[PDB]
Design a binder for this molecule. Sequence first.
Ligand SMILES: C/C1=C\CC/C(C)=C/CC(C)(C)/C=C/C1
Ligand SMILES: C/C1=C\CC/C(C)=C/CC(C)(C)/C=C/C1
Ligand SMILES: [Mg+2]
Ligand SMILES: [Mg+2]
Ligand SMILES: [Mg+2]
Ligand SMILES: [Mg+2]
Ligand SMILES: [Mg+2]
Ligand SMILES: [Mg+2]
Ligand SMILES: [Zn+2]
Ligand SMILES: [Zn+2]
Lengths: 389, 386
Amino acid sequence: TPTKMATLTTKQMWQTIKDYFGDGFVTGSAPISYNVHTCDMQLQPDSGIHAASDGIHYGVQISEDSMPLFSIMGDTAAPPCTCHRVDEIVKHIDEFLERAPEALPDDGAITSGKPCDTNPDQVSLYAMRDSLSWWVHWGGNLRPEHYWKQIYIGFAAIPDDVQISPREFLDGTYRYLGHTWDDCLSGLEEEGVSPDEIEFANMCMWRQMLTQWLEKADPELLPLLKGKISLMLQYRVLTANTLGCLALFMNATADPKDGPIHYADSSYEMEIASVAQCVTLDMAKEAMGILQGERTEVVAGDRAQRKRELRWIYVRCMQILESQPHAHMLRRYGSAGLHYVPMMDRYLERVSGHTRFPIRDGAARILERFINRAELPKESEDINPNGRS
Amino acid sequence: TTPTKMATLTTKQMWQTIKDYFGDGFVTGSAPISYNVHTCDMQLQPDSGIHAASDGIHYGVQISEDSMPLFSIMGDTAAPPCTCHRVDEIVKHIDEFLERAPEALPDDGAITSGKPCDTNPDQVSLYAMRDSLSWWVHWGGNLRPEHYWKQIYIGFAAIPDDVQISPREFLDGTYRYLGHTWDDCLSGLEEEGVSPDEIEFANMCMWRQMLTQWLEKADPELLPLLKGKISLMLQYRVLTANTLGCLALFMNATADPKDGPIHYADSSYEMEIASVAQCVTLDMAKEAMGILQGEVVAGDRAQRKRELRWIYVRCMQILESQPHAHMLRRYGSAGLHYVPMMDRYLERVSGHTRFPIRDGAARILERFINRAELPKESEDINPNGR
Ligand SMILES: C/C1=C\CC/C(C)=C/CC(C)(C)/C=C/C1
Ligand SMILES: C/C1=C\CC/C(C)=C/CC(C)(C)/C=C/C1
Ligand SMILES: [Mg+2]
Ligand SMILES: [Mg+2]
Ligand SMILES: [Mg+2]
Ligand SMILES: [Mg+2]
Ligand SMILES: [Mg+2]
Ligand SMILES: [Mg+2]
Ligand SMILES: [Zn+2]
Ligand SMILES: [Zn+2]
């Protein structure tokens, strides 16, 4: 086998994840591929009689009929089904990638929404803070055996706040806190994640990098999604990559004694949990007054109705999760935004005028080991200055 | 038979009654401020990082202690100093107050909600009913009618924080919560199948709450006496919040029916722990609400919060292995998601105003109002609720 090393074009990456993920329930949807048709989900009144081991006891439980009690919530309403037009979103992207250049002049630009950000590695450092904060609220710990899974969460965070070229992410030109993407894959191998598991998380990361970049590079894409909650929700869950992060979180959290995780068998419950968390993310952001106005706002337009539709989907996602095999992990994952948004600096910084909170010594010492200082550029050599020992 | 006697208890006899019921805690002479668990002796065990699917750690919100520095509204933790052995001095002072205090004060009935637009105490009760259902739901409960009177109980537990209620008027039926006397609630709990011994425990917890909520508003020398003594202030706040009595009824509504009736004698340990933990989450989440209101915490406040977090993480870790972790873990950490979502706290962030009760919420609250026993000035309460 002669050593070949040509890097894929952005168009070829898009085609690769098409071949890997295939179509979802809408023909022509690859790689925007979902198993569950949210519009066909049902919700039953709770019986009020539950066994001690029932899934309802996990996560945060808020019955649909109680939501009008919270002024920041309200009632629910079924959305109009726009799912079948996802193939039109794909064809649009296909056309955009056919004409877009392999490199944009603003690749590497900061898109965090916090104007005091000027160094992309400092933005990465704040993203590592955020990543560990999510991980903890999902139920995880900071133990060293999950280092590279936590780095994965960082890679999943940073393309939201920096415009990362998919090619540069792929070919190692882009580094997150000094790490290339391949470093993360190699580290996951060292941590014992199986090859097929790594490749799934890998393809989810390609898809995240691609969709994060597309919505920054294509001025028509976000306008095409807004107003169509089914399509917008499908897209925003890809840019958040809750599914890829979930797969690795399950790997880190499951006890091998309970038997191995059959991930294909769990694909539906995992998807539902990933969608549910993104809804609680925006539900809690709305309660903090930081959802309205952001460029990627999921509920833009008729905000009141779009939010009714999100709540409609959320309660149905959560009820289904009560009865899934991995409810002891996925219920909390699905509702985690309700407690991590009000506590995390990422969001309180937005409440506070889109500023930056200082990273105190305690947090800096945590973040230090996640920095590969040897591979930082000269202008970033002194990030996290209070975290060294 | 026995002749019909109906004399109402004096506020001292109320205080003495709950002393005989609750007895002393782990400190002698601490009745009725009785806690069996000494929070200062708690020890945090190391996290092996391996937890079975059935492990209680999966319930509620799990935040490892060593990760708390990542959050600017939090930080690290530090053990509190032990002042819980001075609780007997708090009792004897209260005795002194009640041996020279009237049975009726001038400002009994005044509104203490902290929201200046409140003028009608029955409207204040309506907002408290909204808050009560919101807590109940965030603990994990539902709105099914078989728990109506347990939800009324939460209302009785909420309202003494927002209205100065005389313990004797709460007892004799003079005070009505949305038209309900206290006896109406007790009678309803019986009709709902709560065993007599459970009702009486919840009853005595409500007696104790009404007394302590009234003592702190009446005696200006009580709270200053508590301030600076974190372990005593925390014990007193839990009594005035009545998380324990509310927990008892929530557990009764939520427990597996194959579970034998869960009596405080069986589970006093886990119930106290969970009751303390939830009150700490109030302090933790309210700091985030300060930012919303428009990180810099320092000095004694910052030290206070270090000690509350220390208690919280140790309480939550203990709940991992308790038999009712599938209920109490969520109860213990519930403030972390209900404070940022509830009107009660968003109203304060928004300038201590009041949010309108919209049609959907009014229709939920309607059935909790005994309109037949409302005063005339309150007959138009909850107008959009039919
Ligand atoms: C799976 C992740 C978190 C949960 C959802 C969320 C809040 C995403 C935001 C961002 C895209 C920045 C990070 C993704 C990492
Ligand atoms: C057990 C209760 C709620 C949870 C804790 C809390 C937020 C108390 C506030 C107040 C004392 C007004 C009500 C008590 C009812
Ligand atoms: Mg065009
Ligand atoms: Mg985004
Ligand atoms: Mg974003
Ligand atoms: Mg551009
Ligand atoms: Mg109070
Ligand atoms: Mg209060
Ligand atoms: Zn649809
Ligand atoms: Zn002590």
